[PDB]
Amino acid sequence: NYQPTPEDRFTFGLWTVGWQGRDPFGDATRRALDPVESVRRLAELGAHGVTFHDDDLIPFGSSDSEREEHVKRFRQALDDTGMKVPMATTNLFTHPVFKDGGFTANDRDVRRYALRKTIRNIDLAVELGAETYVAWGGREGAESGGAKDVRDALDRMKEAFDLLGEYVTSQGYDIRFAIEPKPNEPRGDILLPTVGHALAFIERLERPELYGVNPEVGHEQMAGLNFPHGIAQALWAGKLFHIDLNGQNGIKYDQDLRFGAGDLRAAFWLVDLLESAGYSGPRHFDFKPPRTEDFDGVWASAAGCMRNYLILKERAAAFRADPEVQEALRASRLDELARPTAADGLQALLDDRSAFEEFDVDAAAARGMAFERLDQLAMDHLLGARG
Amino acid sequence: NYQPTPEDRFTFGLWTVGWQGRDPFGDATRRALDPVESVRRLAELGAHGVTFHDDDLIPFGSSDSEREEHVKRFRQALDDTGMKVPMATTNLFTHPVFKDGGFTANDRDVRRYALRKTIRNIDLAVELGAETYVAWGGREGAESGGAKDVRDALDRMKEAFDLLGEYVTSQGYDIRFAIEPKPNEPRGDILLPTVGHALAFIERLERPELYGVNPEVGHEQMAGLNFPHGIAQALWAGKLFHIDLNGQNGIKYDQDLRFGAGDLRAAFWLVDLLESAGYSGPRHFDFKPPRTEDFDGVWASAAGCMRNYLILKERAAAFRADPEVQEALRASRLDELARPTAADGLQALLDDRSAFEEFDVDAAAARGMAFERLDQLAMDHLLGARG
Amino acid sequence: NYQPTPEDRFTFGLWTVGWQGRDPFGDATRRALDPVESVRRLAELGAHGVTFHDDDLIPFGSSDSEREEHVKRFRQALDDTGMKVPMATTNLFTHPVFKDGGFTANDRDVRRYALRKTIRNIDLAVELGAETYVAWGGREGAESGGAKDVRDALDRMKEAFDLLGEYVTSQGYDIRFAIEPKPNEPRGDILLPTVGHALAFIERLERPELYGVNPEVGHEQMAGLNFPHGIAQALWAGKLFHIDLNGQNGIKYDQDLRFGAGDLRAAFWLVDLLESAGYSGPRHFDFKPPRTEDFDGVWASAAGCMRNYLILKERAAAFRADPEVQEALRASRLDELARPTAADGLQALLDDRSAFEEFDVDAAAARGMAFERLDQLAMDHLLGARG
Amino acid sequence: NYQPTPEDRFTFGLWTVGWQGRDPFGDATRRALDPVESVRRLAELGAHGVTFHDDDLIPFGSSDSEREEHVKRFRQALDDTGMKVPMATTNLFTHPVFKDGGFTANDRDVRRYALRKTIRNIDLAVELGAETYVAWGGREGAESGGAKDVRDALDRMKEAFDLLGEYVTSQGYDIRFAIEPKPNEPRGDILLPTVGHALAFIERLERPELYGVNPEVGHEQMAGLNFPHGIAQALWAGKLFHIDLNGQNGIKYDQDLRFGAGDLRAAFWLVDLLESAGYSGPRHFDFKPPRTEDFDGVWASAAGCMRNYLILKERAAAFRADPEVQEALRASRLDELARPTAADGLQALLDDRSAFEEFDVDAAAARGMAFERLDQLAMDHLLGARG
Ligand SMILES: [Mg+2]
Ligand SMILES: [Mg+2]
Ligand SMILES: [Mg+2]
Ligand SMILES: [Mg+2]
Ligand SMILES: [Mn+2]
Ligand SMILES: [Mn+2]
Ligand SMILES: [Mn+2]
Ligand SMILES: [Mn+2]
C-alpha cells in the first residue's frame, strides 16, 4: 500500500539522510554515510534520484586527483542503481570564509572565490545530468542594520547571477537556476527572504528566463505564510522549477521534519495543487531525520516522506472527483472565479448600470459563500471519512 | 524642539485620527470626527497633507447631490489650511458585499462593482490633486484552502489592475498606483502578502511602470520580516511610490501603533535608509490612537508620530556624519560591498588564479568583520551617548 | 457516521453561532440570533448544552423586569430541549467602560463595578445549573510599558478572585472558577498570557482549590506553544476544569476557526490526551463561523466542530489499541518513562556505580529512540491508512 | 562615559565570550578560549563575576586527577583578578547521550546518569562560592506527539528536582535552584516553555522555597511574550533568583545577541523594572558574539552588553525622577492601581450602591487614560530628547 516507484520522481539530498545530527547545542549522534551507501539504500526504498552540494561529495580542499576518485565511486553507484541526479547545488555556507556570505560578502575577494567555486560545480552537475542548479544564499544577510547596505548587496547578487547565466549560455549547457528562499537562520535576516522576494529579484536579471524558484515548505512557514498560496504564485509566473518538501511547526527554527509532519492540512493542499497543475519536476525532500534516531530511523523517516506524499495524492484526487465536492465547488462559485471580470472591456463596464448604478449591494451581500461545507468535505476526504 | 513643518511632508489618513476605537471585542470609545475638523487640527500640528478612502469622505450611499456638498466642504477646508491631498484609496473591505474580496470575489458581479467603485474615486482623487492611488486588498484571500484557486485569483487581480491602468491612460491622468501588502487579517491569508510578492506581481501587469508598492512597517513585521531590508529592495527596483509609517510589536494582530513605538531600532534603520536614499515622497502615518485615549490623546499620538521621525532623522544624520563611523564602515568593508565583483568579465574571472587556485581561504576566513563595534556606534548615536 | 449525541458533552457559547461577523475592518454580515433559536438548533444538531456571557442574554443596562423576561424565554427553551448550561461567564470587555480592563483597570471605581457585574451573573449561572464560571480577562493588560505596573495589577487581580471565592463560599454555591488565558488581542499584551502563567497565579490565591484553567486551542498556539503539552501540565496539576476547542493557523490574530481546522495533528494529539486521561468535563467550542457564511454555513460549521472531534477520537483509540503501536511504544521506552528514576532513593543513587563511574555513555548514546517509526504509525492511523 | 564597575554586578558565562561560532550550518570561526584568559579579560572590562557549565571548565571525560588541575588553575585566576562565581550549571544537552533529555529521557539509566552528573557539579559550585544553581532543560521535550507522555515527563522532572533539594539540604548547602525556561530549540517543543510554566511547576515540588526562575530575555520573546511583564510576575511571586540578559529579534531561532540589541524598548522597560524593584542579584549576560567577529569583536560585544545596561539605567532613573512624568502617572491613575479595590470587604462592596446601582457607566467610559502622552514622555527620556 502506497509504495513509491521511481516514476513518482522522489529525490533526496545526500545531506538529508546523511545529516549526522549536530545542532547548535549538541554533537553528532550518527556516523557519516558514504554517498555510495545512500544511493544504494535510497534506490531500494523507491527513490528516483539524489542531489548534492559539492562539499557533500568532494571533501573541501580536495586535489583534482582526489576529486576524480570521489566522483568515480558516486558515478558507479548511480550507474548500478539507475538513480538520476536531477539537481545539484553549491555549499557557500559551511566554511568560515563564507561567514559574511558568498555572493554578497563585503570582501570582494570572497565574492570572486564564491563564483569560482560555483562554476566548478556547475560543470560537474552537467556531467552527471542535472537539469536544475539550486542556490540557497544561507549566509547572504546580516545580524545588524549597518553591516549590509541591501541595495549594494542586491547589485552584487544580481552581478553574480548574471555572470552564472553568461557562463552556462557560453558553454551551451542545458541547465536552469533555481533560487531557494529562506527568511532567516543562520543569519539574523537573509536576503530574498520569501518566494515573493526571489520572484521579484529574478525579473531584474539580464536573462530572467534562465531563473526560477526552489521554494521549501518550512521556509515560507517560518514567515507564517501560506505555502500553497506561494506555490500558486510561482506557478502563475511560470517559475516553479523545483520544490523542497518537508515539514515545519510554525514560526521557529528551521526544523526540516519529514514531509507530512508539521502542518498536515497545508501538505494536503500543496499536493492537491501540484498534481492538478501537472507539475512534472522532482519531488525533492530537503529534510533531516531527528537526531534521536539511529540508521533504521533514518530510513524509516525517508520512507515516511514518500508514503505521506502518496497518501495525500490519493485523498486529493478522491476529493476532486467526488460528485458532492463538485456541486459544492459550483455552490461556492469557484467556476465563476475562473471567468473574466470584464471581457466586454473597459467602456462596456463603464456603461453597465448593473455593475453600479443599479447593483443591489444588499442582495449580493446576503449570499453565503458555502465555504465551510466545502472545507468539511475536504476534511472528510483527508481523514478517510468518505471516499 | 523637533517641531514638524509642512516641508517635512508628514501626511495622515482621515481614518487614522478618526478611528473611533471599535475592535473585534469592543464598541467605539470615541465619537466620529468631522473630516473638516481633522484637516484643521492636523494643519495646526504641522502636517503637510491628508489622505482618504472614498467612504471616509463621502458616506456610503450618498446621492450625487450629497456627494458634491461633502467634497465642496472638504476642498474649502483644504484651501483655508492649505493642506495637500497626495494620495487616495478605495474602501473595498468594510461593506458586507466585500466579504469574499473586491477584485478577487468569486462572484463576478461583485468584482465588476468593486472596479466601478474604484474608478469613481480615481476621478475624485485626480480632481483633488492626488499623485498616488493606493490599493490595499484587505479582503482578497481565504480562510480555507478550497475556497480560492489562487492562480485564478491572480488572473482576476491582474485583470482588475490592467483595467485601471487602461482607464487612467485613456483619461490622460498623471497618477500612479501603489499596492499595499499585508500577510493576514482580516482574511486568514491575504493575497500578495509581502513587499516581495507585490513586486513580483507588478512585473506581470500590462504596463508595469504605472505600479509600485506602498509598504507598511507593521505589515512586514507581522511576517517577522526586516522592514528596512524590504524597503531597500523596493528602492532597488525603483518601486517605492509611497510608504505607511507606524509601529508593531512583532507577530500578532495588526496594531497600528504610532511611529517609533513597536520596534525602535528598525525605525532608526528605516529613517536612515529613507533619508540616505533621498526618498522624496510623503511620510504617511497609517496608525490608530489606542482606544484607551480621549481626543487629547488622539492628537498627542499624532504629534508623537512626527516627533519620533524627527528625532530619528537627527540621530541617523549624526551617525552618518561621524568620522569615527565612516572609519568603522571602512573597517567592515562596506565600501568594498559597493565594488563590482567582476567588472573584468567572466573570462577574466575564470583566468584569475588568485580567485581560486591560489586563494588563501584560511587567511580570508580569519578576517573579523568588526560588525559589533559598528553596531555599538549606531546604538550610541541613537541613544545620544555620543554626537 | 460520526453522529454526535448529548453524551459526548459538546457545548457551544451563544456568542459562537451568534457571531454577526463584525471584525476590525468590516460590518456584520449576519443578523442577530435569538438565544431561543440557537438553543433549539444546537439541540437538533446533538449538542449537550450552551454557555453565555451575561451580555449575550441580558441587554446591557436592562432593568430588573426586562432581565426577568429575557431569562424566562431562555429558561423555557432549555426545559423544552433538555439542554444544559454547564458554564457561564461575564462580559468585561465590550462596553467602553472596560477599555483599560475590569479587575485591573487603573480606575478603582471601574474595578468595583466589574466585581458587582460579575457577582450578579454568578447568581444567575448557579440558578441555571452551571458548575463552572469562566473568566477571560481580555482587557487586562496594556499597549505601552508605563500604563500598567504589573505587580500592582496582579495584586488587584488576586484581590478580585479572592473576593469572588469569598462570595461563592459564603453563599454555599457549588461552582468553581476557570481562568481563560490569551497572550494578546485586543490588548497589546494581556496579563496571565498562557496556561502556565494562569496556573502559577492560581497558587497565590487564598483558596486555590476553587480555581483552575479554561485553556483554548488557538490562544496557546498564538504564542507558538504546544497545546497538548500545556493541557498535560494542567491535567498534571489537577487544574483542567474546562476546555475551549477551536482551530488556529499559527501566530497571528485570534481566528477561532472550527475545531479540526488550523493544526490538525495537534487536534489529534489533544483528543488522544483528553480521552486517555478520562477528562469528563464539557467539550466546549469557542469558535466563530467565518463571516463569508450565511446561516446554513453557521450550522454546518458548528456540526463540523463535533464531527471532527468524533473522527479524531476514533483514530486515536485505534492508534492506542493497535498491537503494532504497542510494540513501537515499548521500542521507544514510553513504559520506562512512566517508572521512577530513583525509587531506591538518594543514597542508593549516590552509591550506584552503574549510574556514573561505570556507566557506558557511548553505548547509551548509540541507542536509537525509534520515534520516527512510532510517529509514522500515528500518521497512518490519523489518515486511515490502517485500522 | 558609562563605565562598568564590579559594583554593577555584571556577570558572564564562560560559554558566552568563549563561543567558537559553530551553528547548524557552519563550522567554528574562532579558536577556543582558555577559561583563565576569559576570567582576566572580563575582569579588565569591568565584570563582577563569571559562571560556568561543568563541561566549560573541565573537559568531558577528565580523570579525577585532571579535574583537580583544571579547578586549581581557575581558582587561582579568580583569586588574582578577584572575580566572583555567583552561579553554575550542568551541561545536560551537548553529549549525544542526552539526545532525548537528561532528567526526562525515556531511558531510566540516562536519567540516573544526568542526576549524578548534576550532583557532582553542585559540590564544585558550592566550593567556588556559587549562590544559585541554574538548570536549563534544553533537551527535555519532543519533536513528535507520541514520543513523550508529558504527565510522566513532569513526574520525572519533579522527581529529579526533589532529589536535588534533598541532596543540598542533607549537605547543609546554602544554594538555591533557578529553572531557565525556553519554548523550543534544540527540541521541537521544550517542557516548561515559559516563565509561567516554570513558576507553576515549582509550586508542586516538595520544597518550593528552594526553587525560582532564571528567565532569559530572548527565550520569552521567542514565544512573542512581553519579557518585562513576565519578570514582574516572577518578582510578584518572590521567585526571580537570577536573570539572563541578551537580545532577540522576535519569533525565530534563539539569537543570543548582546543586551540592548533586538527589542530596545523592552530592554528599557526591563531595566526600569529591575532597578525600581531593587533586584540585587547578578546582571548575567547569556549572549553569543556573532560568528562574523574576531576576538577584538568578542570583547567589543561584551563591553556593549554592560554599556547598554548602564545607558538604559540612566534614562530609566531620569524618567522616574521627572516631575512631569510623576504628574503624567497620576493623570493615568497608576497611583489608583496601587489602591485596594475593596479593602472594605465583600459585604460593604455588595451594599455600595455607588459601585453598581448608581454607577454612571457613561461618564466613566468617557475618561481618557492619557497613556499616549505618558508613553511619549518615556520615549523622549530613552532617546535623550529631554532630561
Ligand atoms: Mg531547502
Ligand atoms: Mg496601511
Ligand atoms: Mg475562549
Ligand atoms: Mg540562558
Ligand atoms: Mn529548511
Ligand atoms: Mn496596519
Ligand atoms: Mn480565541
Ligand atoms: Mn538563548
Side-chain angles (χ1 to χ4, degrees), chain A residues 15 134 136 180-181 214-216 219 244 246 254 256 284 286:
Chain A
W15 70 91
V134 161
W136 171 60
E180 176 174 351
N214 179 48
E216 174 178 310
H219 292 179
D244 274 7
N246 55 22
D254 186 34
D256 291 348
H284 181 245
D286 188 1

Side-chain angles (χ1 to χ4, degrees), chain B residues 98-380:
Chain B
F98 298 122
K99 59 191 196 320
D100 191 37
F103 297 161
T104 70
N106 284 359
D107 288 315
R108 183 193 166 250
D109 49 11
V110 172
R111 301 196 297 271
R112 291 172 71 83
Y113 175 71
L115 277 165
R116 293 286 313 274
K117 190 175 195 286
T118 300
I119 287 167
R120 221 153 92 101
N121 205 54
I122 292 174
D123 290 337
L124 175 57
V126 172
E127 295 202 334
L128 297 179
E131 326 215 44
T132 305
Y133 201 88
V134 159
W136 170 60
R139 297 278 175 206
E140 320 299 334
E143 283 69 61
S144 48
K148 211 54 91 163
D149 176 316
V150 170
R151 291 163 299 153
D152 297 331
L154 292 171
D155 284 342
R156 297 294 79 73
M157 191 89 87
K158 165 174 167 62
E159 187 183 1
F161 278 104
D162 282 342
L163 283 164
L164 296 176
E166 175 196 34
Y167 180 72
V168 300
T169 60
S170 80
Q171 294 294 84
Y173 292 161
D174 279 329
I175 197 169
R176 64 193 146 241
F177 293 103
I179 297 166
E180 180 177 353
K182 190 180 188 187
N184 66 69
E185 198 201 39
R187 310 303 310 267
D189 292 287
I190 294 171
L191 303 183
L192 310 184
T194 78
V195 163
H197 294 76
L199 288 170
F201 169 85
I202 285 166
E203 298 300 326
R204 291 297 199 271
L205 298 176
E206 176 77 2
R207 284 154 182 121
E209 60 291 344
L210 292 187
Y211 310 83
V213 286
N214 179 46
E216 177 178 309
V217 174
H219 293 180
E220 302 300 299
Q221 290 174 358
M222 285 171 74
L225 298 176
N226 179 316
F227 186 71
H229 287 187
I231 297 309
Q233 182 169 348
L235 286 168
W236 185 77
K239 293 292 191 189
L240 189 72
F241 288 5
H242 198 267
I243 196 171
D244 273 7
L245 304 172
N246 61 9
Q248 169 76 16
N249 286 298
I251 305 186
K252 48 167 55 85
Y253 72 96
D254 165 55
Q255 292 194 285
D256 287 351
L257 304 171
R258 80 190 188 281
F259 180 68
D263 187 336
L264 176 56
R265 281 250 276 173
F268 169 86
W269 290 114
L270 170 64
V271 171
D272 173 63
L273 174 63
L274 291 179
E275 299 302 320
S276 283
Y279 169 71
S280 39
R283 276 72 172 170
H284 181 247
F285 299 103
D286 190 355
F287 87 114
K288 288 182 163 83
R291 77 195 274 279
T292 57
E293 303 305 289
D294 65 14
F295 273 121
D296 177 280
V298 165
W299 307 117
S301 198
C305 283
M306 298 181 290
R307 175 175 184 86
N308 289 334
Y309 192 102
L310 292 175
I311 298 169
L312 296 173
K313 172 174 179 187
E314 173 195 72
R315 306 310 165 82
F319 173 72
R320 298 273 173 200
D322 186 347
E324 178 137 15
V325 169
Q326 290 304 314
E327 184 48 58
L329 292 165
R330 277 201 290 300
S332 296
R333 284 89 82 196
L334 270 302
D335 56 333
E336 283 237 287
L337 182 68
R339 283 327 154 169
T341 295
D344 47 337
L346 177 59
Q347 183 81 99
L349 174 70
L350 290 172
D351 289 333
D352 182 6
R353 270 178 82 90
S354 74
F356 189 76
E357 288 89 349
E358 298 167 8
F359 186 58
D360 187 352
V361 87
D362 272 339
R367 284 185 226 131
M369 307 290 336
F371 288 154
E372 284 296 279
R373 188 169 128 53
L374 172 57
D375 192 58
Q376 189 58 46
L377 285 173
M379 182 77 93
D380 285 357

Side-chain angles (χ1 to χ4, degrees), chain C residues 99 106-109 111-112 116 155-156 159 203-204 236-237 333 336 339 341-342 344 352 367, chain D residues 99 107-109 111-112 116 155 159 204 236-237 332-333 339-342 352 357 365 367:
Chain C
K99 63 192 188 294
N106 283 0
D107 290 314
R108 172 193 226 270
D109 55 358
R111 302 197 296 271
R112 291 172 69 82
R116 293 285 311 274
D155 281 349
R156 296 294 80 73
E159 187 181 1
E203 298 297 323
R204 299 282 163 130
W236 182 78
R333 283 90 84 197
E336 211 164 319
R339 323 271 263 181
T341 297
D344 53 343
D352 183 5
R367 296 185 206 130
Chain D
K99 59 191 196 320
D107 288 315
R108 183 193 166 250
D109 49 11
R111 301 196 297 271
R112 291 172 71 83
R116 293 286 313 274
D155 284 342
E159 187 183 1
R204 291 297 199 271
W236 185 77
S332 296
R333 284 89 82 196
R339 283 327 154 169
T341 295
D352 182 6
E357 288 89 349
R367 284 185 226 131

